[model samples]
Target chain A: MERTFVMIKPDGVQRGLIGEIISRFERKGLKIVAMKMMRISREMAEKHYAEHREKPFFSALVDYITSGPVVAMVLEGKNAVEVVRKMVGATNPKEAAPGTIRGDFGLDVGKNVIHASDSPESAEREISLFFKDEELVEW
Target chain B: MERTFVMIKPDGVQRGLIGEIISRFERKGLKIVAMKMMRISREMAEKHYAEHREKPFFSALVDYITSGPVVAMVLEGKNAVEVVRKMVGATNPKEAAPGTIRGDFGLDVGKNVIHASDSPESAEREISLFFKDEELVEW
Candidate 1:
């Protein structure tokens, strides 16, 4: 078993895709170890996207992520990291394949609808970054 | 408001994504007017995929869809057909974007997790084919 982190970006929440997005994972037989709906702060956003801090779009990324409330979750399942990545599709919706999250619901890369941990290391880091010990449940 | 028909294929049902998948449409503010868990008949599967009958994969498709119980449902909302399509993602998961239903959960085209009507006409036909008038409920 493994765990991965996924988040519905502000656009996803604003557009009312929270249920739709979560249902995908749920249907996959993945377990929700931790979940919450919260508005991310600029500080939290910066910390979360720290790896991309040196990139030119860092500021914009933080701004957009912090613009509204987001649904953050930790999902546990076999090959969770890789599986969630496939579900999220390409970062740029234009390049994302059909049947993917971005491919179907998104039009612009700047406002892609969601985010998922891309690797196992990132999954551990991200889960800790967003959730506390008690926040996760084992069922 | 419009109505759309969606089905969780046998593979999807076996993988246990039913609750998760349904939640997506629900979270998207769509209403579930009718739903049931049933094992599809060979005849039902053939009729449902009639458009693909002449295609070489027809028999395999029918066999696969009827292998287990499927969750058939009707969702109601504005532009439900189009909206649900976007949410369901690409038909080929490898090419599907990250956030879509297919993009996230499916990897093989043949075993892609869910099916939705492609247009208003198809939605009408498919819904009628699967559900009777009394099966549908209105809020």
Candidate 2:
């Protein structure tokens, strides 16, 4: 089994969609090995988006993400990285599929409700960034 | 504002209803001041059910809760204890109202999926027993 990192962004937390969003993955057979509600630090946010540093909207992204408490989780399953990416849908909510998390709850690209690691490397890095090795439990 | 304790029990965890159950309270406009997914210790479970120590069901209850991980949370809002009690529904799933947490997801009393504080005193007691003083965040 593989593990993927998924996050309920600040908007998702503020709009009360954490559980609803997580339900999608759970229903799809994902196993949550670790989970917590946490407030993000700006330094961590900057590091989290280092790859996007050259982009024009980088600061706004960081600002929004650090605005409120968010839920972080590690989900494990076969093909988890791809499965979660499909469930999360397009970055632009308007272009997302109707059944996807973004499609069901978001209308703006800037406020899309969820984030999932796009690849294995990304997932591994993200999990390490937000959680300690011992924090994740094996069931 | 008031605070109440709510738990997604072992059955709920095994059945993958953590997000869905939490979503119900979240949609009801409650604020989650603190939350974590943790494995319950047998010692803690015994203390949690101390009021029922004389009841024949206490041992079974402890065994069930300690069988796997559970999600514990503190929700804050007006009339939180009463509001959450109504949301959690009857202990016996058969009698729980439709649209309630138990009613929507449960079919047996032995495996009802969630628990919530029934009164102000119970809420406070449960909170202190499961969470540290600094763990709860006020926003």
Candidate 3:
């Protein structure tokens, strides 16, 4: 009865991993509620990463996210946030285990193939940041 | 240089094949330009299958499509329509070649997991019917 936000980043979209990435989630039996592909705006990226504003890689993160289009999604199921985070893999792509998204397709941390909200609160917040109320379909 | 329309039918979406089917296209380098998951309205489904309105099984087809949500998408790439047709496989799941979408994932002819236009014109028509100009993203 929860939903998690997941996004295939610029790298993922550019590398044609959008569909592959989504498939893993689907096969896991998570219900997709809302989804879209769009290029990120600098302002939107900034707001999305507001929690890490002081981090050194923050600027580079914004630049890369806005560099290409991304696939944004909302997946619902039990412990969705935790499950999606596992599927996304460890932050450092090099350290991510095999079978994980970053492990299979990601080569660099800076170019990780996907992103997912780490917790329930962040899931709701991140989803709201990118999607409007009416955009999410209940079914 | 061309765009084609592909849809995961209600059966596909309900069966959680959306991601798996899309991944097959992406792995072949088809670029996803637009995508959404929406429940097909009865009216919209009727218009979508308008050409078959007079055909016998049309009612069942429309009824099935409107039974649940579906994922609609526009994919771009070389010979998009023809390429997608190949990837989608023949109408009969049993006759479809292995590795193809329906061949690999579809079981019932009446419940083919995915749909792709048989011709470029059909692709164009389906794309226009499912998406608005602004909904397509250019990257």
Candidates 1 and 3: which is better by DockQ? Answer: 3
Per-prediction DockQ comes to 0.18, 0.67, 0.65
**Model 2, span A1-139: residue lDDT tens:** 7999989988998888988888888899899988888888899999999989999999999999898888889999999999999999999999999999998999889889889999999999999999978768667
Best model number under lDDT: 2
Indicate whether candidate 2 or candidate 3 has the larger lDDT: 2
**Structural similarity to truth (TM-score) of each candidate:** 0.56, 0.92, 0.92
Per-residue C-alpha lDDT of model 1 across residues A1-139, encoded as one tens digit per residue: 6899899999999999999888778755579989999999898899988889999999999989999999999998766788778777899999987666787789989899999999999988988888888999989
Ordered list by lDDT, greatest first: 2, 3, 1
lDDT of 2 by residue, B93-121 (tens): 89999989899898687689888998899
DockQ category of candidate 3: medium
DockQ of 1: 0.18
- Deviating ranges (above 4 Å) for candidate 2: none
lDDT preference between candidates 1 and 2, better one: 2
Residue pairs with clashing backbones, model 3: A23-B19
For residues B1-139, write the lDDT of model 1, one tens digit per residue.
7999999998888887898799888899999999999889999889888889999999998989989899999999999999999989889765666657886677668889999999999999998899889999889
Interface RMSD, candidates in the order listed: 4.5, 1.1, 1.5
Runs of candidate 3 with Cα error greater than 4 angstroms are: A54-56
